[PDB]
CSV table of C-alpha atoms (C1' of nucleotides) and ligand atoms in Angstrom, one decimal:
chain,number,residue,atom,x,y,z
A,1,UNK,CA,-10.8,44.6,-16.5
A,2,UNK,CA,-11.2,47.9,-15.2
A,3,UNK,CA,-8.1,47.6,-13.1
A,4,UNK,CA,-5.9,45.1,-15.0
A,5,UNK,CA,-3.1,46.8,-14.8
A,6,UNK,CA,-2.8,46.5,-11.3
A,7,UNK,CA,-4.5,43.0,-10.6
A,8,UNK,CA,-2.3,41.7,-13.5
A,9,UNK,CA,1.2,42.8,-10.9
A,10,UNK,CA,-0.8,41.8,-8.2
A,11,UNK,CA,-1.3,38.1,-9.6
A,12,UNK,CA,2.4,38.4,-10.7
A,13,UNK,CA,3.6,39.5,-7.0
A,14,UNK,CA,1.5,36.4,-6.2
A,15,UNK,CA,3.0,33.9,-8.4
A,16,UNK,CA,6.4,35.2,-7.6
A,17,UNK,CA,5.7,34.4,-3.9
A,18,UNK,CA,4.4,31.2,-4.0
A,19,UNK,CA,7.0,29.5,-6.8
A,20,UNK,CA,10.0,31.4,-5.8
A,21,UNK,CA,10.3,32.6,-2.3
A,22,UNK,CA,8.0,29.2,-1.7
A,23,UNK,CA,6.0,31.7,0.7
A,24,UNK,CA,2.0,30.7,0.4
A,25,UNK,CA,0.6,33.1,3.0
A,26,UNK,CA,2.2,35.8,1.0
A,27,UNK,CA,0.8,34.1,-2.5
A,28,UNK,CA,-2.5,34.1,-1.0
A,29,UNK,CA,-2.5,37.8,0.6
A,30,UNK,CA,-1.7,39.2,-3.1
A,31,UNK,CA,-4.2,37.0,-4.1
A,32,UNK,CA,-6.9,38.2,-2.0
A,33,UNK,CA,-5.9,41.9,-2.8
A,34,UNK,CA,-5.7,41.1,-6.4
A,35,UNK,CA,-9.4,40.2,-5.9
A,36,UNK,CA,-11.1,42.4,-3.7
A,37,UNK,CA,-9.4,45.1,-5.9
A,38,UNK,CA,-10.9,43.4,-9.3
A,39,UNK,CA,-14.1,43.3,-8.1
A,40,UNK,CA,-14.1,47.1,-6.6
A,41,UNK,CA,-16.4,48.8,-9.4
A,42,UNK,CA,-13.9,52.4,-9.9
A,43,UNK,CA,-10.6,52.7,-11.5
A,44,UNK,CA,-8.7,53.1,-8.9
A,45,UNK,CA,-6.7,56.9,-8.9
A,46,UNK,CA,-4.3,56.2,-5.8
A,47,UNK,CA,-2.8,53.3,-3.1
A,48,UNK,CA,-4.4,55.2,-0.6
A,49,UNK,CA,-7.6,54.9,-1.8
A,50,UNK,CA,-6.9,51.1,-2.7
A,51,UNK,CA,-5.9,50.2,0.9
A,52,UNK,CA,-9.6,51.3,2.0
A,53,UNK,CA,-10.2,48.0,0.7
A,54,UNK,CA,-9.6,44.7,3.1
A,55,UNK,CA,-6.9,43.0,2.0
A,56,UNK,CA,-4.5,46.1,0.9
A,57,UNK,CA,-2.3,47.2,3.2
A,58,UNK,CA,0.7,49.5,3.7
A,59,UNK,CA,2.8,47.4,1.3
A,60,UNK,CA,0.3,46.8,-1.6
A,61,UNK,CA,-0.5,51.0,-1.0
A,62,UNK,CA,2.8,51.5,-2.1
A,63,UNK,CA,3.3,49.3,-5.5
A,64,UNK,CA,-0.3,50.7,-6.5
A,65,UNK,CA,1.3,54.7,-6.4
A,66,UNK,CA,4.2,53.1,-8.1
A,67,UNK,CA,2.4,51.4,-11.0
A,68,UNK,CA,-0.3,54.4,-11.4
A,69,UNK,CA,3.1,56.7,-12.2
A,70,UNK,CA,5.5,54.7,-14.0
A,71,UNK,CA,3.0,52.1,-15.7
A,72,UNK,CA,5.3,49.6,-14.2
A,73,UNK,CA,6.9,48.0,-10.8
A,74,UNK,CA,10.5,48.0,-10.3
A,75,UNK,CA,10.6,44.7,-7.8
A,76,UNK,CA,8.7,43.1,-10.8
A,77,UNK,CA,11.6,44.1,-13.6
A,78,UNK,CA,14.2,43.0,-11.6
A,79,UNK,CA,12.6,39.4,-10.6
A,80,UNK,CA,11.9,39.0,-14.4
A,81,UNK,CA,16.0,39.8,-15.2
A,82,UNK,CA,17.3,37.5,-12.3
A,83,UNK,CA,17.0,33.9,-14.4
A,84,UNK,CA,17.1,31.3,-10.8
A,85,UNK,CA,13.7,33.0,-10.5
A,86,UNK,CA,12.0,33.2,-14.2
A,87,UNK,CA,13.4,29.7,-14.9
A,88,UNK,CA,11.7,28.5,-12.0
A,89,UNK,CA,8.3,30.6,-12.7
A,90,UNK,CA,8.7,28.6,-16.2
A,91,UNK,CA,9.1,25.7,-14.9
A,92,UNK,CA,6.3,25.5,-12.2
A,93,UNK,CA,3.5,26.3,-15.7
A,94,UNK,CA,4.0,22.3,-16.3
A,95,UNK,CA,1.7,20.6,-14.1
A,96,UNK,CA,3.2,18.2,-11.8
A,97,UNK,CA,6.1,20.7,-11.7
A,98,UNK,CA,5.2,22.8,-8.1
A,99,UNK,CA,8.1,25.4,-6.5
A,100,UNK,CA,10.5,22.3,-5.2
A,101,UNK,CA,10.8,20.3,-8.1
A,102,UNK,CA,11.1,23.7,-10.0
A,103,UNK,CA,14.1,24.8,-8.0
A,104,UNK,CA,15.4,21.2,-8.0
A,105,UNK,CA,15.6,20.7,-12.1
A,106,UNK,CA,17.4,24.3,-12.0
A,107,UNK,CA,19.8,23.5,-9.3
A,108,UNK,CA,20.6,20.5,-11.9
A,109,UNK,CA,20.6,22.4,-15.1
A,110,UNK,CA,17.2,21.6,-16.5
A,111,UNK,CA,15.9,25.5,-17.1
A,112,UNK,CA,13.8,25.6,-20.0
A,113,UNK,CA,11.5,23.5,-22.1
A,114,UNK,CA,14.3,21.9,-24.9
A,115,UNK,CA,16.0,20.8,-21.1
A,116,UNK,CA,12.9,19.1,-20.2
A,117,UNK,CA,12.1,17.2,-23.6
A,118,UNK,CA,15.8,15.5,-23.0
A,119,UNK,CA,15.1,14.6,-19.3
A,120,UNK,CA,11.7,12.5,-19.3
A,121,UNK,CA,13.6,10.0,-17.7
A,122,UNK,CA,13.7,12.4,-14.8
A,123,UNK,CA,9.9,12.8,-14.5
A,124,UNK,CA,7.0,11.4,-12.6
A,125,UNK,CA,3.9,10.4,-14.6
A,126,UNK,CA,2.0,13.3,-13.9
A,127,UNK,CA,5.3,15.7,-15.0
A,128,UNK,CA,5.3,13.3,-18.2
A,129,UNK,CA,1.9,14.5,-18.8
A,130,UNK,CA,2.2,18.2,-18.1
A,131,UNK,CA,5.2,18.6,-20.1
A,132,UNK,CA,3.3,16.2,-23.5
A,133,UNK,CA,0.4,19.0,-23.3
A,134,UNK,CA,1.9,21.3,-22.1
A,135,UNK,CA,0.8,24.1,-24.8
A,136,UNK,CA,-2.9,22.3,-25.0
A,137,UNK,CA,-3.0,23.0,-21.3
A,138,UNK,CA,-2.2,27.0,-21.2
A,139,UNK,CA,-5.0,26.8,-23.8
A,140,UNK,CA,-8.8,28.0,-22.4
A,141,UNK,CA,-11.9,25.8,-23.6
A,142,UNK,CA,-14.7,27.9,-25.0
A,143,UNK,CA,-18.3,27.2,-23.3
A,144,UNK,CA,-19.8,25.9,-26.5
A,145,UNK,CA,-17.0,23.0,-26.2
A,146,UNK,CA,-17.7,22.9,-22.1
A,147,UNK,CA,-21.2,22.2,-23.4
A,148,UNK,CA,-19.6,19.3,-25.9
A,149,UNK,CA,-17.7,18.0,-23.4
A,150,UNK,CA,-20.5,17.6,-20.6
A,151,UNK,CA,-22.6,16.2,-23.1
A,152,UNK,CA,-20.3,13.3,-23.9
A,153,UNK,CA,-19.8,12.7,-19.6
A,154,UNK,CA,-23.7,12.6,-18.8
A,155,UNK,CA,-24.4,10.4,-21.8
A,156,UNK,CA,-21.6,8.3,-21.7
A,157,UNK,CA,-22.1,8.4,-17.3
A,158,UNK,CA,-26.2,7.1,-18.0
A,159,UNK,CA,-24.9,4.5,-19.8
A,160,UNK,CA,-22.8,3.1,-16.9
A,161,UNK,CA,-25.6,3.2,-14.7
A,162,UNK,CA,-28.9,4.8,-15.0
A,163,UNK,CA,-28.7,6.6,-11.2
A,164,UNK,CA,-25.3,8.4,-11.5
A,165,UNK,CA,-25.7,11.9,-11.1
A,166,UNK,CA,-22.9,14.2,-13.1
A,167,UNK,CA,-22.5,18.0,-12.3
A,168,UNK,CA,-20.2,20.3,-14.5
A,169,UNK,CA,-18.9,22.6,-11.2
A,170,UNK,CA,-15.9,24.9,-11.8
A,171,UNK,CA,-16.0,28.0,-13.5
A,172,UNK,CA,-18.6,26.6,-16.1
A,173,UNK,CA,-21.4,26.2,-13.3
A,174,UNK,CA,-20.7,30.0,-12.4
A,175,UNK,CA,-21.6,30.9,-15.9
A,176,UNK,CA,-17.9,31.2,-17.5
A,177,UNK,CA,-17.8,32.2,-21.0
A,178,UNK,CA,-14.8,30.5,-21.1
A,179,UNK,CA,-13.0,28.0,-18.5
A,180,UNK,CA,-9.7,26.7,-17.7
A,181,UNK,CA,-10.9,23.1,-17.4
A,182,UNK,CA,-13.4,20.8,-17.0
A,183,UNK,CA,-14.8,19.9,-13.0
A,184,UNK,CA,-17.4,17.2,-12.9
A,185,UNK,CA,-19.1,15.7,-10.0
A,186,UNK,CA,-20.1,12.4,-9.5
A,187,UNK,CA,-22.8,10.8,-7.1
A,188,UNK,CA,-24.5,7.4,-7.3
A,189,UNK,CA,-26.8,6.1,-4.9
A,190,UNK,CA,-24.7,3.0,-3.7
A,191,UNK,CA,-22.5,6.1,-2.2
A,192,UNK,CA,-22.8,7.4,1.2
A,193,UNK,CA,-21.2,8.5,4.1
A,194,UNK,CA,-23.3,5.6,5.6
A,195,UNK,CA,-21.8,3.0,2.6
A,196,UNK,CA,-19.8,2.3,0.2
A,197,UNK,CA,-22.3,-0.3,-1.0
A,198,UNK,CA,-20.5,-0.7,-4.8
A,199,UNK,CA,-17.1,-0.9,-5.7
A,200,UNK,CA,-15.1,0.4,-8.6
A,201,UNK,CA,-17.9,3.2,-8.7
A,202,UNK,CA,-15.6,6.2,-10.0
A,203,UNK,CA,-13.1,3.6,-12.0
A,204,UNK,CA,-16.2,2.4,-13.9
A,205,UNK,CA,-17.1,5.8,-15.1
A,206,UNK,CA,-13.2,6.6,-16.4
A,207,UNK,CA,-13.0,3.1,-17.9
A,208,UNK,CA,-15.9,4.0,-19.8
A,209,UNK,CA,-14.8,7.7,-20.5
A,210,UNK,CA,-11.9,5.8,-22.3
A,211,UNK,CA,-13.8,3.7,-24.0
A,212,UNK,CA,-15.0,6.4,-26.1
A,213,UNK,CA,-11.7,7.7,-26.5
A,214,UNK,CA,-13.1,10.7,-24.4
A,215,UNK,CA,-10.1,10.4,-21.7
A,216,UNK,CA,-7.0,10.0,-23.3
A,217,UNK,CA,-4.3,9.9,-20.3
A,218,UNK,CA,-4.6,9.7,-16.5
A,219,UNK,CA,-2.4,12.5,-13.9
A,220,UNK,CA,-3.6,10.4,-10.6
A,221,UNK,CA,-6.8,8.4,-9.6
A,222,UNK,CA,-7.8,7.2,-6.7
A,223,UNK,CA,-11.4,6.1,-5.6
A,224,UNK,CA,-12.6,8.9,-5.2
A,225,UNK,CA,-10.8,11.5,-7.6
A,226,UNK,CA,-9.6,11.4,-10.7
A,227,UNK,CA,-7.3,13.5,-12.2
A,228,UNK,CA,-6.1,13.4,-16.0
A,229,UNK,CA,-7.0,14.4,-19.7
A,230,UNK,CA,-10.0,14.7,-22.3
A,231,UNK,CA,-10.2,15.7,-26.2
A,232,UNK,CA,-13.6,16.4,-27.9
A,233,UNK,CA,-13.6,14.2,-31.1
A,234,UNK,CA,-13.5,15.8,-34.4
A,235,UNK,CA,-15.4,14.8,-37.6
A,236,UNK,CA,-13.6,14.2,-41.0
A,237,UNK,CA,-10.7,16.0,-41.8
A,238,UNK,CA,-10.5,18.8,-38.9
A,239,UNK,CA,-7.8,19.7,-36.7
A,240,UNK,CA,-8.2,17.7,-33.4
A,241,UNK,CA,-9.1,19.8,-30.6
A,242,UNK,CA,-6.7,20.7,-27.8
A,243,UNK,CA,-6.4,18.1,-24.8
A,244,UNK,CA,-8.2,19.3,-21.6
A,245,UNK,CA,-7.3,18.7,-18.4
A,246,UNK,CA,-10.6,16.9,-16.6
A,247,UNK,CA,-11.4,16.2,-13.2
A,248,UNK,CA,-13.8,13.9,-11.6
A,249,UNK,CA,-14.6,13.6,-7.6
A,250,UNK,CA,-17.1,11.0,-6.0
A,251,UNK,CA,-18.8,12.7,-3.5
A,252,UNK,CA,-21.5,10.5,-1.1
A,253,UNK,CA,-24.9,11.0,-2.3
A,254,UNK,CA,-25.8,12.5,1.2
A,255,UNK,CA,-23.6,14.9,1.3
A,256,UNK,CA,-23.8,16.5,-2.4
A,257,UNK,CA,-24.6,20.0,-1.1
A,258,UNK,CA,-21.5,20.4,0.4
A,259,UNK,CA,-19.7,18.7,-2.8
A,260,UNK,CA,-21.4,21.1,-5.6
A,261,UNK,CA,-20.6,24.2,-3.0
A,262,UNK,CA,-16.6,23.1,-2.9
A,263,UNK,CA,-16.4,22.4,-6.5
A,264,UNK,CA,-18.4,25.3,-7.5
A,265,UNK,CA,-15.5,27.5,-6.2
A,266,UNK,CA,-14.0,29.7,-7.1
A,267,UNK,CA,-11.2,28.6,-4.6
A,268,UNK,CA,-10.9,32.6,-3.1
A,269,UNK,CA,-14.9,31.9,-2.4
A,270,UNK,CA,-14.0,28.5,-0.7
A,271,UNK,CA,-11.2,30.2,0.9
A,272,UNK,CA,-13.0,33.2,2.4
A,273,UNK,CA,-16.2,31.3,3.2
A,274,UNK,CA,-14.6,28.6,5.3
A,275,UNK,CA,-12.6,31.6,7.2
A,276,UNK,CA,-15.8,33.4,8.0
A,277,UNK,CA,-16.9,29.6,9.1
A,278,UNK,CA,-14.9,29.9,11.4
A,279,UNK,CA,-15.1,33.4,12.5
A,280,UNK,CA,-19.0,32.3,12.7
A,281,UNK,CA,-17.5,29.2,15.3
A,282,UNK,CA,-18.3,26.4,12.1
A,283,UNK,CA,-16.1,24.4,9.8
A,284,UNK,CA,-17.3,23.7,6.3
A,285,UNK,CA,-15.1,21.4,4.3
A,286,UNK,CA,-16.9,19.6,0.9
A,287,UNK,CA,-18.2,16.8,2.8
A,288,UNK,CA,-19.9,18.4,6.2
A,289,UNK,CA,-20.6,21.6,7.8
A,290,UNK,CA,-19.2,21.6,11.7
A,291,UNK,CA,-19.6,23.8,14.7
A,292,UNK,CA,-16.5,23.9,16.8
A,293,UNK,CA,-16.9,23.5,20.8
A,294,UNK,CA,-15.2,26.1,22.9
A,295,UNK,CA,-11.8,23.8,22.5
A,296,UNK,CA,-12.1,24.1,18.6
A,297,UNK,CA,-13.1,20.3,18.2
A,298,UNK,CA,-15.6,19.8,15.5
A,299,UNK,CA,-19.0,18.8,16.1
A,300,UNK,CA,-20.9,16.8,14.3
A,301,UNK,CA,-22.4,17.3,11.1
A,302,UNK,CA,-25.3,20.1,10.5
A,303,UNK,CA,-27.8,18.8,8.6
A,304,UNK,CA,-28.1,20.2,5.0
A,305,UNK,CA,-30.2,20.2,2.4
A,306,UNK,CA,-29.4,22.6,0.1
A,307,UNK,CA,-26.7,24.8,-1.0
A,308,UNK,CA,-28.6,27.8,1.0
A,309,UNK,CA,-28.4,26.4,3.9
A,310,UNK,CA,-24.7,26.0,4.4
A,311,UNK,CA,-25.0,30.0,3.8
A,312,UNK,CA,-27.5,30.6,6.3
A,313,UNK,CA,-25.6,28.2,9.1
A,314,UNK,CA,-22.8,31.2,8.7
A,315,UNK,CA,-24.6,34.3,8.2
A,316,UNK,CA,-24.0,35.2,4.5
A,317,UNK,CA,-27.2,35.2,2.6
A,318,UNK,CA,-27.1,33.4,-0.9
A,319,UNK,CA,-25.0,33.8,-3.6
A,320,UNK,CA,-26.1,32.4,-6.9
A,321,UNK,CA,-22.5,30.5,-8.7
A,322,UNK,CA,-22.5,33.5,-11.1
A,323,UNK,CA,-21.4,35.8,-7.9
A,324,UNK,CA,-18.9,33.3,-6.3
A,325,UNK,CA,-15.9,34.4,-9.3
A,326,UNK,CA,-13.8,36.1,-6.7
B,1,DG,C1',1.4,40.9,3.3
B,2,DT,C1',-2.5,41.9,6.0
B,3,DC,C1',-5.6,41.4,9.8
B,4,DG,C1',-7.8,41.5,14.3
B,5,DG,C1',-7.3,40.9,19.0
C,1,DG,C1',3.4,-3.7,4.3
C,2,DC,C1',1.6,0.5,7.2
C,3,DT,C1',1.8,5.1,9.0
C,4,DG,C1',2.9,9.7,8.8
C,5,DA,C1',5.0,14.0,6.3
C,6,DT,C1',5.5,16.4,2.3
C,7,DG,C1',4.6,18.0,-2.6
C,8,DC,C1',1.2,19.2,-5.7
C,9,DG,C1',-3.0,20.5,-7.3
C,10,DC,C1',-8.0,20.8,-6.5
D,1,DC,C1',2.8,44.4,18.3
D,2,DC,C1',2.0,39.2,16.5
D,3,DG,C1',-0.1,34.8,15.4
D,4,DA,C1',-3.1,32.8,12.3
D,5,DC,C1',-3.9,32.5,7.4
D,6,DC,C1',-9.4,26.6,4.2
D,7,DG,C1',-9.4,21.9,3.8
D,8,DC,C1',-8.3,17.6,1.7
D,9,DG,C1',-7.2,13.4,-2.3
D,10,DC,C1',-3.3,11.2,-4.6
D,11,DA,C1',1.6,10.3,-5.4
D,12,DT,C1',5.7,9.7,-3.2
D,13,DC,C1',9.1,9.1,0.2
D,14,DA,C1',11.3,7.8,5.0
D,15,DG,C1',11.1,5.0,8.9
D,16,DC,C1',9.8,1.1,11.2
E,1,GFH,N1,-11.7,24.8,-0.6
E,1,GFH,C1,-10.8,25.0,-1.7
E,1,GFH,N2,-11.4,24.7,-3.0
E,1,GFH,C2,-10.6,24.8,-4.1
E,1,GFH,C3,-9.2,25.2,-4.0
E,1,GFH,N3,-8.6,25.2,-5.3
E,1,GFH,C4,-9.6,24.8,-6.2
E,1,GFH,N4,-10.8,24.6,-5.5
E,1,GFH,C5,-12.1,24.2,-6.0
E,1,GFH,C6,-13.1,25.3,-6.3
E,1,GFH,C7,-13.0,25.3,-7.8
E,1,GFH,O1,-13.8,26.2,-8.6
E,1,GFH,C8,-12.8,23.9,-8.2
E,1,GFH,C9,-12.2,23.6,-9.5
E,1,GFH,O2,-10.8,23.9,-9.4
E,1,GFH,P1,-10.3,24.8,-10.6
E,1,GFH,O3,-8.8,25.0,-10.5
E,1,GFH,O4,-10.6,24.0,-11.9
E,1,GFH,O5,-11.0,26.2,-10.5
E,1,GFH,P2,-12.1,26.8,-11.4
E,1,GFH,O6,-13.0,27.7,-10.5
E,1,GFH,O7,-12.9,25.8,-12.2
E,1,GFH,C10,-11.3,28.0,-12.5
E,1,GFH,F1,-12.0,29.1,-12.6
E,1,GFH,P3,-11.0,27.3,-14.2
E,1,GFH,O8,-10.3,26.0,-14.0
E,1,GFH,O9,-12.3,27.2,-14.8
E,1,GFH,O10,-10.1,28.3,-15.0
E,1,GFH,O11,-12.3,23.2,-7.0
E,1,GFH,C11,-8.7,25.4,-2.7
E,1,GFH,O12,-7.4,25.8,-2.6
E,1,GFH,N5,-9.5,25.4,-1.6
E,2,CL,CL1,4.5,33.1,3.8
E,3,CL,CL1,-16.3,15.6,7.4
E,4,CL,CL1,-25.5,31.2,-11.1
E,5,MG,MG1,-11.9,24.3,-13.5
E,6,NA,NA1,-8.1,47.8,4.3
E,7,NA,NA1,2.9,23.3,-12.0
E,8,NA,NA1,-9.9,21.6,-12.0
DNA sequence: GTCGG
DNA sequence: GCTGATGCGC
DNA sequence: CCGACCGCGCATCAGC
């Protein structure tokens, strides 16, 4: 926080990009600045001094000297006037809503949340969803409920079968005081990138989840991710808790160091570790980690068996989750 | 928008 | 149906 | 300059 004024435009700048000028290279370059910047450990007095970091260049130089004077960015006011563009920023905060569908429901009318409520006939099942909770969903979940909430999965995930294996990943496994949503992985044995030796291995897991009354409404699934929405349970006569969004990926047993390093994030980490993976001449995705030949083909997979080793492949000594928040 | 080649 | 492209979100 | 910018699961759509 000791340069939220200027990572907050940055991240503004960013979401700006990427739901309104649909521009994601842009949405990621703010990004990036916005991070290298909110890790850099001095208040930062000038643009000049900000663009001695990687990731700020000319342009960023610029709108830092502007905010440090004013306390505030023109190109920012004026996108928060124009209402095509702060209608569609509203619109994208529903999930299932991304930049087209935004720009679509405007171009018919439907701007704000009252136009939304009357048009659930014009929504997929995941918009349905986002748009039900969609106040629950801007809503963080304090770590003592993370700690709640994974208690109920790995229970209720022993009972299904004894040799399932459930991570919390996300922001919680990085030590989060406080985290957006909930990011479990999965592996059982019968699960490899040999095998598939059991079917219905993730399904079981949410069929049971609903049992309990744990998951209360499914976004997508497939067989190996599900996507949807948790609420703790509540004794006699409390409010309920907020619903949470949850995910749930089934990763082969084999290839779990990969997984927990993926879902572990943060998704900048992912982002600038697989680009120095390649800069190093390897690929890392959350199954495998790759070399590429001289035509860029990958190779076959590295053999792994720990997080730390992934690390080493690619010359970056270790970083405990606590240190991966970028 | 920023970077490295 | 299947395959491939896109949208969306991780 | 200027070309590349992580990698992929699921839903959904178009074409065959
Ligand atoms: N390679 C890659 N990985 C990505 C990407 N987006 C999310 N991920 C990853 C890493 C996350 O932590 C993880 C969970 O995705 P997430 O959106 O729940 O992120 P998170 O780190 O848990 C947030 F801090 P929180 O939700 O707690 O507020 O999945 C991506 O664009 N590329
Ligand atoms: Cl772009
Ligand atoms: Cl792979
Ligand atoms: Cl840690
Ligand atoms: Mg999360
Ligand atoms: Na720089
Ligand atoms: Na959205
Ligand atoms: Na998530």
């Amino acid at each position: 926080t000791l340069n939220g004024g200027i990572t907050d435009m940055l991240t503004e700048l960013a979401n700006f990009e990427k739901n309104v000028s649909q521009a994601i290279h842009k949405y990621n370059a703010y990004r990036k600045a916005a991070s290298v910047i909110a890790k850099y450990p001095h208040k930062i007095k000038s643009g000049a001094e900000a663009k001695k970091l990687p990731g700020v260049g000319t342009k960023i130089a610029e709108k830092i000297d502007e905010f440090l004077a004013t306390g505030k960015l023109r190109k920012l006011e004026k996108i928060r006037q124009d209402d095509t563009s702060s209608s569609i920023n509203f619109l994208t905060r529903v999930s299932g809503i991304g930049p087209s569908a935004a720009r679509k429901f405007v171009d018919e009318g439907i701007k704000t949340l009252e136009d939304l409520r009357k048009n659930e006939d014009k929504l997929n099942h995941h918009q349905r969803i986002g748009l039900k909770y969609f106040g629950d969903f801007e809503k963080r979940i304090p770590r003592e409920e993370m700690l709640q909430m994974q208690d109920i999965v790995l229970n209720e995930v022993k009972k299904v079968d004894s040799e399932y294996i459930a991570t919390v990943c996300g922001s919680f496994r990085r030590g989060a005081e406080s985290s957006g949503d909930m990011d479990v992985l999965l592996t059982h044995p019968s699960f490899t990138s040999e095998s598939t030796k059991q079917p219905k291995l993730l399904h079981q897991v949410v069929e049971q989840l609903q049992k309990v009354h744990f998951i209360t409404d499914t976004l997508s699934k497939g067989e190996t991710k599900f996507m949807g929405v948790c609420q703790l349970p509540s004794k006699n006569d409390e409010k309920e808790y907020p619903h949470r969004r949850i995910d749930i990926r089934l990763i082969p047993k084999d290839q779990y160091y990969c997984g927990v390093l993926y879902f572990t994030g943060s998704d900048i980490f992912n982002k600038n570790m697989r680009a120095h993976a390649l800069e190093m001449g390897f690929t890392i995705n959350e199954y495998t980690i790759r070399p590429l030949g001289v035509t860029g083909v990958a190779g076959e997979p590295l053999p792994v068996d720990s997080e730390k080793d992934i690390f080493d492949y690619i010359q970056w000594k270790y970083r405990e989750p606590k240190d991966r928040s970028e």
